[PDB]
């Protein structure tokens, strides 16, 4: 927008990569309808859908923090840009990424929010239940003024 940020540096190899978004534990985003359900209670049968999967679930993706962790284990260097709350679950997510040697200087804490918690209101429009968002979680509330430009430069 205006200028740079940080001090220019020889920038160690391998080159850094930045992953932007929400840091979540598991959480498969791609959800569609499958026509071959197992028993609703006996989850010991559910592994049979892991070896005969729905086509959309043959190689599922996940949150961007998964890519950052996987990239580091493959020998790269990665930094995560995002926001977590100041609660205990937020620390656990950051400690998970620090253990995997992912840079977390781009991670901002929101001390007034609960990590991975969205406030929603339940309504009954046209005889059907729906929900609408009242307050977004800290994971989806990173502001532009909170971006770490040293990471984006490197």
């Amino acid at each position: 927008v205006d200028y740079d940020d940080g001090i220019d540096f020889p920038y160690d190899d391998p080159p850094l990569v930045c992953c932007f978004g929400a840091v979540q534990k598991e959480f498969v985003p791609v959800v569609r309808v499958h026509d071959n359900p197992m028993h609703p209670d006996i989850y010991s049968q559910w592994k049979m859908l892991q070896w005969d999967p729905p086509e959309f679930g043959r190689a599922p993706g996940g949150p961007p923090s998964n890519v950052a962790i996987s990239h580091v284990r493959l020998g790269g260097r990665a930094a995560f840009m995002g926001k977590v709350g100041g609660d205990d679950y937020g620390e656990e997510l950051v400690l998970m990424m620090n253990k995997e040697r992912v840079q977390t200087r781009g991670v901002k804490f929101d001390e007034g929010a609960s990590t991975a918690c969205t406030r929603v209101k339940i309504k009954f429009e046209d005889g059907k239940m729906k929900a609408e968002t009242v307050k977004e979680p800290p994971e989806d509330s990173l502001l532009a003024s909170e971006l770490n430009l040293a990471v984006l430069k490197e």
């Binding site: 010991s44 049968q45 592994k47 049979m48």
Partner: protein, 57 residues
Amino acid sequence: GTSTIPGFNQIQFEGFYRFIDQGLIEELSKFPKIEDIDHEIEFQLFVETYQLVEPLI
């Protein structure tokens, strides 16, 4: 047994259930009606009302 190792005692467990659930009738229905030489007195078993009582001990 389709997606886990089955219980190691399953063969014994299913077999005993089949004996109680179906095995008793097949043998209790092969019991002949008993008639004497003179055919005066006849003894029979009403198998449809067979019962099993839980052990007292």
